Amino acid sequence: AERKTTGWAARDPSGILSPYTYTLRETGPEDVNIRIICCGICHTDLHQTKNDLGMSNYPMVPGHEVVGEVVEVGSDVSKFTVGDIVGVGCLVGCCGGCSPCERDLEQYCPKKIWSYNDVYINGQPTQGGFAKATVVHQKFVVKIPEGMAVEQAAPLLCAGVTVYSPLSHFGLKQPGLRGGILGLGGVGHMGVKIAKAMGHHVTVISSSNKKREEALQDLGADDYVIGSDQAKMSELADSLDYVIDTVPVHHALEPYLSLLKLDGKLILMGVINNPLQFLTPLLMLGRKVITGSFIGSMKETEEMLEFCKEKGLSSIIEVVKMDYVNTAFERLEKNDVRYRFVVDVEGSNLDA
Amino acid sequence: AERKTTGWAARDPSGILSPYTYTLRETGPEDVNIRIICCGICHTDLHQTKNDLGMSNYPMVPGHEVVGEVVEVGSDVSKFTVGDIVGVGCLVGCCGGCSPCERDLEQYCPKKIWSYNDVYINGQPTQGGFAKATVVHQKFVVKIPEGMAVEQAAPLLCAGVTVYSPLSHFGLKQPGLRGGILGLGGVGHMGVKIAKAMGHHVTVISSSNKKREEALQDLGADDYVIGSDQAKMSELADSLDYVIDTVPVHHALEPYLSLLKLDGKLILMGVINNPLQFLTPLLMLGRKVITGSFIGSMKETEEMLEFCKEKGLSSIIEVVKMDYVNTAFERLEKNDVRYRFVVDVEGSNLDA
Ligand SMILES: [Zn+2]
Ligand SMILES: [Zn+2]
Ligand SMILES: [Zn+2]
Ligand SMILES: [Zn+2]
Helix, strand or coil, X not given: CCCEEEEEEECCCCCCEEEEEXXXXXXXXXXXXXXEEEEEECHHHHHHHCCCCCCCCCCECCCCEEEEEEEEECCCCCCCCCCCEEEECCEEEXXXXXXXXXXXXXXXXXXXXXXXXXXXCCCCECCCCCECCEEEEHXXXXXXXXXXXXXXXXXXXXXXXXXXXXXXXXXXXCCCCEEEEECCCCHHHHHHHHHHHCCCEEEEEECCHHHHHHHHHHCCCCCEEECCCHHHHHHCCCCEEEEEECCCCCCCCHHHHCCEEEEEXXXXXCCCCXXXXXXXXXXXXXXXXXXXXXXXXXXXXXXXXXXXHHCCCCCCEEEEEHHHHHHHHHHHHCXXXXXXXXXXXXXXXXXX | CCCEEEEEEECCCCCCEEEEEEECCCCCXXXXXXXXXXXXXXHHHHHHHXXXXXXXXXXXXXXXXXXXXXXXXXXXXXXXXXXXXXXECCEEECCCCCHHHHCCCHXXXXXXXXXXXXXXXXXXXXXXXXXXCEEEEHHHEEECCCCCCHHHHCHHHCHHHHHHHHHHHCCCCCCCCEXXXXXXXXXXXXXXXXXXXXXXXXEEEXXXXXXXXHHHHHCCCCCEXXXXXXXXXXHCCCCEEEEEECCCCCCCCHHHHCCEEEEEEEEXXXXXXXXXXXXXXXXHXXXXXXXXXXXXXHHHHHHHHHHHHHCCCCCCEEEEEHHHHHHHHHHXXXXXXXXXXXXXXXXXXXXX
């Protein structure tokens, strides 16, 4: 293609990252060429890296929470002008001609191409944002809002829209609503920020008192309930408009469906690889919903970023240099990060 | 109270009906006193009768698809004028002061009182529509539309709104939609009528070729698929906007979720007493909904009846006299009815 980049790749299920040089494509008519400033780390990167889901193709450059600079723009693009600080999410392509793609629900396209570990329309293995540059179709790039900081808008490109997409789709953008956040991972954490920011009563549900300081002090949730403290669990019995169910492992749905009121939704966003249960007469009891959501579209990623700027959301990111990415992976695995990690990619890896 | 009626009650789990005389209440300020013309039979009546659900209180007069005449009206009622042919559904009371009752979603009230087998606000056991009369709170009575026949509007009071309530709530009243009707019971049968009448492509799904003539000839569904004929089951793989899941026993949800397109709903309306399964990454795949619905409110029962008159729906009812109710129960059990049963209650049971 048109020139080379170096970035840090994984090349076996041990997931240890070391520099890897590769060729980027020629900036085609619709493409946008980006000089990556920083890239965020989150568990997807930890999962594909070490294989885990049994489907990793190596060499693999992670990073899907990308924010950089348009240095070059394809023959047709006009949204972006060179110089613009832009950002790239989990996807880099879709078929553009099926009903999800026309509806601007391209994350739901059957033929979506992922940031890395996939293969693009030209036959090339997609590589992440842990590199000094990337070329991305203009449809999968977003202008990061003006006051917004780069390492700030990078968690927001992944966990931001995963929460804001349902909160916007299920009509839950309304002030007043009562929500539960079951699970305090990354998506959970953002749940308590975007929900609380939309004007919602946010109750964080867990299983131990470890996330009390986090949910109540650092997240500002209105009270914390242990999913096993039956006293307070029953006072909640028909008060919640929705539940953002974030737990990745198998759990009983019925205790959480129980907190829900008439027409209440349980939005599931952790992948439980084993079939979850529900007792059918209780969904009938409250015209309750069991649903799910896969990330966000690009229209919603604009919306969400704009929203967090307006409402001034601020996650507590920890910015590390690229030689630290392996210990940063060890710690993100042992949950030793003070909430999020952002790799400063202008803390470079020059390897021609 | 104020006078006696005779009707036919069940008095043990054998469910055999024989005349039973009892006292109706005094028409209180909000109450409406009705002279029952005809009453429909459906499986609820067959279930409570023979106990089945382990909770029947005897003596028990069935019938919850009631249409009769207001002979007397309480001190405050003004909707109804004596002479009006009215109808009564599954419920006869609710708390009137909780959020479902204010929202006009009274069927979802925690404190709803059922037609029979329950106990009313005055302490009296509620008794059905298999009697020559009943007194009902004005809130649980509906004016049967003008051209509409009495034995016609009686199936419609139960199976009508059970279908029309979700079809109206989930925004599925729109022409064009593709729906599946999984299960051809009573609710299923009405599904294929109200869906087809709203301007939908109706595909009836089953497990054998017995309901072909019924679904295609007598119901006018657009094609029939055996849920096990994998060839045609896979050509349907992302075409349906919704599924009215009507099967009362445990079944795999995932084959039926598979027919659904982006944002497709599976509306469950048969009570599976054992927890149904779903693989969580596929709901995430299509932002698919698993939901349920318990009958309809009274506003929706007006709407629905008015709708079936406008669209001229006509179920094939079989009108029997009250001495036939036991053989009619035997046959409704062996599914020997040419679709619905209606007991002519002006084919009387005088027993003082
Ligand atoms: Zn991420
Ligand atoms: Zn597409
Ligand atoms: Zn019925
Ligand atoms: Zn109520």
